[PDB]
A paper describes a structure:
PTENα/β, two variants of PTEN, play a key role in promoting tumor growth by interacting with WDR5 through their N-terminal extensions (NTEs). WDR5 is a highly conserved protein with a seven-bladed β-propeller fold. It is an essential subunit of the SET1/MLL methyltransferase complexes, which regulate gene expression by catalyzing methylation at histone H3K4 sites. WDR5 performs its role by presenting H3K4 for methylation, through the recognition of the guanidyl group of H3R2 by utilizing its central channel of the β-propeller structure located at the top face.
Author numbering:
A (entry chain A): 32 to 334
B (entry chain B): 10 to 18
The structure:
C-alpha cells in the first residue's frame, strides 16, 4: 500500500478548479478553472508561477505538449486555445465546435490536438496551423473525454450516450464501439500506459478496465461516489501499480490495479474532487476540487 | 463565470 501524505495546498483560483495536469517533464502543474484562468505551479514545491488568461468563459480541461512548452485549453466559450507556457501568450484559437468544449489532449507526437464537445463531435486539429483536420460525428450526447494512445495511432472517446469508441487517427474511421448492457453515461476514459486497455468511468459509481480489442471487462473499481460529474482517473505507475480517482464524497481514492482493493483514501478537500493527476516520475498526486473548495492539493508517497 | 465540467448533470 502507498502512504500518500498531504504536502501542499495551492490556493488562488477564485472559482471551481476543473482540471490539473503535470507537465511531461515533471517540472510543472497546470490547472484550469471556472474562473476562466489557467495557472502554472511548481510540481515539487507547489509554488505559483503564473496566470494565463484570455478565454471568455470558464475552462473545463487543459493538456500539455510533449516538450512541456505548450498548453491547450477547452472552454465553455466553444473554443480551444493553444498557449506558449513560457510567455503565457495565446498562440492559436481553435474554432469550429458549436457548443462547450469539454475535453482535450495532444498526441504523443504533439503535432495534433483532439477535442470533444457538448456538440457531440470530436475534432482533430493541426497544432502548427490551428486548422481543423477532421470532424467526427462521434456520439449522440456530450463527449466527456478524448485521449490518444501511446503512439498516437488511436483516439478513445467517451460520451453520456454510454459508449466508448476507438478511432483510427489517420482515417477517422471508428474501429470499435464498446457497449456494456444498459450503457450508463460514460463520464471519463483514457488509454492505459501500454495502450492495450482503456479505463472508463460511468455515472453509477464505477470504474472499469477494458481490453477494448477483445471487448472484455477485466477489472472493476468501486467504493467511491460518482453519479454527477466527469471526474478524471489515472494509472499511477511510478511506484506500485494503482488506479487513482476523485470522488463526489470529496476524497481521493486509490485502488490496487490488480486486486481492486481500496488501498488509500486522501482526505482534505471540502468539495467534489473533480480531477487528479499522477506525476510522470515521482510518486506525487495532484488533486483539485470544485466551488466550495477551489484548491489544488499535492500529495507524496514512498511507493 | 462557469465551466461545464464544474456543473452537475
Amino acid at each position: 500500500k502507498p502512504n500518500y501524505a498531504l504536502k501542499f495546498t495551492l490556493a488562488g483560483h477564485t472559482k471551481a478548479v476543473s482540471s490539473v495536469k503535470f507537465s511531461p517533464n515533471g517540472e510543472w502543474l497546470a490547472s484550469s478553472s471556472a474562473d476562466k484562468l489557467i495557472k502554472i505551479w511548481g510540481a515539487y514545491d507547489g509554488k505559483f508561477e503564473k496566470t494565463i488568461s484570455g478565454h471568455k468563459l470558464g475552462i473545463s480541461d487543459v493538456a500539455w505538449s510533449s516538450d512541456s512548452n505548450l498548453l491547450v485549453s477547452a472552454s465553455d466559450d466553444k473554443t480551444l486555445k493553444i498557449w506558449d507556457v513560457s510567455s503565457g501568450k495565446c498562440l492559436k484559437t481553435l474554432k469550429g465546435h458549436s457548443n462547450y468544449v469539454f475535453c482535450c489532449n495532444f498526441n504523443p507526437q504533439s503535432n495534433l490536438i483532439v477535442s470533444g464537445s457538448f456538440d457531440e463531435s470530436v475534432r482533430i486539429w493541426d497544432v502548427k496551423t490551428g486548422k481543423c483536420l477532421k470532424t467526427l460525428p462521434a456520439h449522440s450526447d456530450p463527449v466527456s473525454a478524448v485521449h490518444f494512445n501511446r503512439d498516437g495511432s488511436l483516439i478513445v472517446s467517451s460520451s453520456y450516450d454510454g459508449l466508448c469508441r476507438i478511432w483510427d487517427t489517420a482515417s477517422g474511421q471508428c474501429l470499435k464501439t464498446l457497449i456494456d448492457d444498459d450503457n450508463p453515461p460514460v463520464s471519463f476514459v483514457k488509454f492505459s500506459p501500454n495502450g492495450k486497455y482503456i479505463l472508463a468511468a460511468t455515472l453509477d459509481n464505477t470504474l472499469k478496465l477494458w481490453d477494448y480489442s477483445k471487448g472484455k471487462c477485466l477489472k472493476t473499481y468501486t467504493g467511491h461516489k460518482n453519479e454527477k460529474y466527469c471526474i478524471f482517473a489515472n494509472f499511477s505507475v511510478t511506484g506500485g501499480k494503482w488506479i487513482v480517482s476523485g470522488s463526489e464524497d470529496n476524497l481521493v481514492y486509490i485502488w490496487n490495479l490488480q486486486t481492486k482493493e481500496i488501498v488509500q483514501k486522501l482526505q482534505g478537500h471540502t468539495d467534489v474532487v473533480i480531477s487528479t493527476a499522477c506525476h510522470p516520475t515521482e510518486n506525487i498526486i495532484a488533486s483539485a476540487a470544485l466551488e466550495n473548495d477551489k484548491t489544488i492539493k499535492l500529495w507524496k508517497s514512498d511507493c
